[PDB]
Amino acid sequence: PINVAIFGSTGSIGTNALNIIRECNKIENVFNVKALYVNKSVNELYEQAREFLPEYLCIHDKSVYEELKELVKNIKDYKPIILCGDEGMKEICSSNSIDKIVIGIDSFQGLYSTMYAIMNNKIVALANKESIVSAGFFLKKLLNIHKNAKIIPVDSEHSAIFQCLDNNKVLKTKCLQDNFSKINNINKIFLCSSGGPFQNLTMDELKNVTSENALKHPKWKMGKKITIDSATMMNKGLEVIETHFLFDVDYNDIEVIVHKECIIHSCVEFIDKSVISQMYYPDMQIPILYSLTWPDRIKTNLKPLDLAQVSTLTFHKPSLEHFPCIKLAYQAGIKGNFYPTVLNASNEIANNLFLNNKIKYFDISSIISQVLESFNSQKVSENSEDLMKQILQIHSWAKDKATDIYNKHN
Amino acid sequence: PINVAIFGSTGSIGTNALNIIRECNKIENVFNVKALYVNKSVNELYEQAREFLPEYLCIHDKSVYEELKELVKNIKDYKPIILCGDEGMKEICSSNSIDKIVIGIDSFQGLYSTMYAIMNNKIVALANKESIVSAGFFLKKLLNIHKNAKIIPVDSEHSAIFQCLDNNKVLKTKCLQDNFSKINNINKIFLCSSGGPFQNLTMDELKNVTSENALKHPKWKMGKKITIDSATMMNKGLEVIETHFLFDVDYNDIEVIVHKECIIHSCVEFIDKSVISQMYYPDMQIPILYSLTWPDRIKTNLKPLDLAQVSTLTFHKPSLEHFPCIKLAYQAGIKGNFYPTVLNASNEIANNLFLNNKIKYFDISSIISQVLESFNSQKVSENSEDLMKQILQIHSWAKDKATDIYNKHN
Numbered sequence: 001p002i003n004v005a006i007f008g009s010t011g012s013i014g015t016n017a018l019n020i021i022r023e024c025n026k027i028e029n030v031f032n033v034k035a036l037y038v039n040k041s042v043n044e045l046y047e048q049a050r051e052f053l054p055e056y057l058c059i060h061d062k063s064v065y066e067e068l069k070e071l072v073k074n075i076k077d078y079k080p081i082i083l084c085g086d087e088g089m090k091e092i093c094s095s096n097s098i099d100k101i102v103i104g105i106d107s108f109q110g111l112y113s114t115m116y117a118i119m120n121n122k123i124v125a126l127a128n129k130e131s132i133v134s135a136g137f138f139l140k141k142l143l144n145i146h147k148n149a150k151i152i153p154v155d156s157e158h159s160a161i162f163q164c165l166d167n168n169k170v171l172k173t174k175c176l177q178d179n180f181s182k183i184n185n186i187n188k189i190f191l192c193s194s195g196g197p198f199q200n201l202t203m204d205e206l207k208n209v210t211s212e213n214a215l216k217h218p219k220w221k222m223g224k225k226i227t228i229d230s231a232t233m234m235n236k237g238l239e240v241i242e243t244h245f246l247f248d249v250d251y252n253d254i255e256v257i258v259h260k261e262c263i264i265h266s267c268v269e270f271i272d273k274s275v276i277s278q279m280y281y282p283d284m285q286i287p288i289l290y291s292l293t294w295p296d297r298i299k300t301n302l303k304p305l306d307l308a309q310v311s312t313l314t315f316h317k318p319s320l321e322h323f324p325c326i327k328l329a330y331q332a333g334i335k336g337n338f339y340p341t342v343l344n345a346s347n348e349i350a351n352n353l354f355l356n357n358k359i360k361y362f363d364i365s366s367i368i369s370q371v372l373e374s375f376n377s378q379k380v381s382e383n384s385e386d387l388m389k390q391i392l393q394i395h396s397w398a399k400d401k402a403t404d405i406y407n408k409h410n
Numbered sequence: 411p412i413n414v415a416i417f418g419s420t421g422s423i424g425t426n427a428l429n430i431i432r433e434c435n436k437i438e439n440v441f442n443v444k445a446l447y448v449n450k451s452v453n454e455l456y457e458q459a460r461e462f463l464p465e466y467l468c469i470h471d472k473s474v475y476e477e478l479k480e481l482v483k484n485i486k487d488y489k490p491i492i493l494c495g496d497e498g499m500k501e502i503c504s505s506n507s508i509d510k511i512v513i514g515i516d517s518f519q520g521l522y523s524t525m526y527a528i529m530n531n532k533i534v535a536l537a538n539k540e541s542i543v544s545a546g547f548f549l550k551k552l553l554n555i556h557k558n559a560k561i562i563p564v565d566s567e568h569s570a571i572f573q574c575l576d577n578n579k580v581l582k583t584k585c586l587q588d589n590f591s592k593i594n595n596i597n598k599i600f601l602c603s604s605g606g607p608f609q610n611l612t613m614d615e616l617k618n619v620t621s622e623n624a625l626k627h628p629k630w631k632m633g634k635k636i637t638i639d640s641a642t643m644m645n646k647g648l649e650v651i652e653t654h655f656l657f658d659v660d661y662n663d664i665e666v667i668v669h670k671e672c673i674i675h676s677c678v679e680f681i682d683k684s685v686i687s688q689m690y691y692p693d694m695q696i697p698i699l700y701s702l703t704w705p706d707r708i709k710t711n712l713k714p715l716d717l718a719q720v721s722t723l724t725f726h727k728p729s730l731e732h733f734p735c736i737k738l739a740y741q742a743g744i745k746g747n748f749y750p751t752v753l754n755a756s757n758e759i760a761n762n763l764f765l766n767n768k769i770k771y772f773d774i775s776s777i778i779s780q781v782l783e784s785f786n787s788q789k790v791s792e793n794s795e796d797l798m799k800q801i802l803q804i805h806s807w808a809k810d811k812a813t814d815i816y817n818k819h820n
């Protein structure tokens with residue numbers, strides 16, 4: 001039995017995780033949902049508790065703690081350990097009855113819970129790409145200390161890449177470890193992109209495109225922030241850096257390719273030039289499930305891929321003139337140091353300004369470029385706690401710098 | 411240091427094997443070519459011996475044995491073991507210095523050599539699909555006795571399938587064994603076909619196609635027999651049965667799909683419904699090389715796949731009305747017993763009759779159908795020697811029956 005905790009159980013990753021766990025458990029009892037953790041959605045956590053009956057419930061916000069306790073009394077034959085805040089999260093991470101932790105929380109609490117999952121030598125199914133981009137050095141250092149911890153990628157392209165690898169090789173290394181690509185005989189990565197809603201726009205059309213245009217065309221339904229990143233292709237820019245850190249692939253060996261059908265989820269070229277790819281309908285249940293079953297697979301009742309019906313798969317190179325965020329991401333990654341931290345932080349601000357109709361499409365990349373140009377490389381801290389503080393300081397500086405650039409031009 | 415013998419070294423598979431070995435050896439000294447074996451092409455063998463300097467040379471035709479001995483005296487610093495006939499082939503197979511044997515021989519001598527390779531517990535890189543189709547039972551039995559012997563598939567689609575698997579699971583089993591698909595979590599196979607030259611033709615157009623029409627294959631120059639099989643799609647029919655035997659995949663779980671670009675070489679759907687596929691330009695060096703490097707990969711200098719340039723990949727269902735050979739292959743496979751032997755043997759005759767303008771396109775399938783309808787299931791011998799004799803008897807019976815049907819019509 002696979003003992004799982006879900007952090008951010010009411011968000012998109014968390015709900016998809018529970019959906020595929022539910023369906024797989026109908027076929028064979030494979031998963032024990034041991035713990036659920038949410039910020040403040042007490043009623044939604046209660047409904048999940050009633051169905052899954054986890055040993056642990058944790059809610060971050062103290063103001064709904066007593067309500068959760070009273071709601072849980074209604075459930076028959078059920079006496080969970082009901083916990084609160086960062087201390088509850090740490091208790092869940094340290095439990096000997098939990099093997100795998102799904103991190104479906106964004107922002108700092110995602111990184112913080114990832115840190116504690118790694119410190120307790122757990123398998124960590126990580127969906128939060130911003131944490132890998134911003135704090136990749138820190139995660140690498142931490143995984144080198146806590147040698148039985150493993151990050152398994154959930155981001156769909158990185159799951160695809162991971163699924164293209166021979167586990168006879170993967171098991172002799174792990175993600176975020178130096179020489180991962182060499183041990184797995186990886187030569188090059190094709191990183192697939194939907195292209196986003198603006199993929200066919202002219203430069204003149206891009207100049208005054210708005211957030212409404214990005215949001216009101218959802219071919220895949222997803223959150224506002226990632227939708228804007230998909231529109232600018234900064235999502236793929238971040239994913240390039242995510243690929244570099246997860247798999248130790250050189251930036252010159254990562255190619256972004258626009259695959260509008262979203263069937264092939266990414267491809268790995270090996271040193272012999274044979275290419276392996278992973279394919280399915282766009283459905284986050286497969287990447288999430290693989291993160292929890294790896295190195296095995298289990299039966300699902302998902303719709304089988306009908307390739308004949310799909311009929312055509314297409315690929316083209318993205319235009320860097322139309323999607324300058326892609327170039328900025330490569331430049332930041334190649335520069336190294338804390339430039340990825342700065343890229344991510346400045347994008348956080350610029351994305352949100354565009355989302356709220358404060359700046360235009362090309363202002364996004366302008367702001368990010370200016371913050372990157374402003375940044376000065378720092379000596380990388382040797383101590384993990386100092387390094388974390390350094391990352392947070394630079395993240396905060398870069399957000400403030402982006403906001404300051406906006407305030408001056410406004 | 412990979413120790414390899416090449417059987418049929420001057421044929422298409424043999425020459426491609428030596429080509430990729432040559433190129434890979436320039437990058438790193440990986441392969442020692444330990445033995446070369448040919449029928450009667452003494453000059454071509456001498457030229458290969460000059461380059462590769464194998465410990466063993468064998469020529470099947472005793473009439474050119476002394477000629478080979480005299481030619482080989484011209485090579486400096488080289489004192490090989492020079493053998494002849496079946497006795498030389500068997501001595502090579504029994505050598506402790508040889509680990510892997512590439513079988514690039516068609517017809518009976520290919521099967522006989524495969525048998526001896528298996529009896530000596532070697533890794534056998536096998537492209538001869540007709541032998542797997544015709545004698546799969548016998549090969550399975552032989553592989554159960556000789557526990558360290560392994561067949562590694564070289565047929566491009568089956569190499570593709572094999573490359574899509576997790577070697578952590580493959581290493582717990584081996585090809586042409588019961589439960590291979592269960593151990594590897596395989597649910598279903600997409601078996602890719604070029605579709606040959608006739609995909610867009612009407613039934614009335616197919617009625618009148620000639621072997622000259624059939625020989626103009628859209629993607630690939632290859633031998634006349636396989637070119638005719640590609641035109642009728644009996645090539646894919648035979649490969650369906652090959653898939654069933656190599657990977658223990660049920661016939662209901664093998665889907666033939668027409669992929670005219672011949673970039674994706676086949677796909678494996680796992681029990682979670684995730685699909686893995688292998689891709690490269692049409693080039694037999696990749697399947698041959700993997701058969702010799704498995705479970706590892708080595709560096710090549712092959713042209714990298716340019717997916718953006720390829721641009722489009724297409725997939726559609728084959729029409730069984732237009733390509734009735736496909737249906738006959740499934741029927742023979744599903745029926746089991748020696749029906750695959752009969753299918754292969756009758757096709758051998760019908761293919762050749764069509765190639766030499768003696769029958770029409772739909773006569774190929776008509777003849778095969780009539781022979782299959784005339785066969786009666788026979789009790790399968792539990793004795794290995796009697797089983798091989800049954801297979802030979804039924805093969806011969808089926809060829810004669812096909813010829814008799816033609817004769818009585820003609």
Ligand SMILES: Cc1ccc(CCC[C@H](CC(=O)N(C)O)CP(=O)(O)O)cc1
Binds near residue numbers: 156194195281284
């Ligand atoms: C599994 C799956 C594959 C593809 C899609 C379509 C959206 C792709 C991505 C969102 C993402 O980063 N995922 C899903 O990891 C948008 P884009 O950057 O344009 O490729 C959804 C779900």
Ligand SMILES: Cc1ccc(CCC[C@H](CC(=O)N(C)O)CP(=O)(O)O)cc1
Binds near residue numbers: 565606639646697
């Ligand atoms: C490696 C490689 C892949 C594909 C091709 C194109 C010809 C495909 C095949 C020939 C074959 O059975 N091979 C190569 O195993 C013809 P078809 O039956 O129509 O699919 C050539 C070479």
Ligand SMILES: [Mn+2]
Binds near residue numbers: 239
């Ligand atoms: Mn993604």
Ligand SMILES: [Mn+2]
Binds near residue numbers: 565566567649
């Ligand atoms: Mn083939």
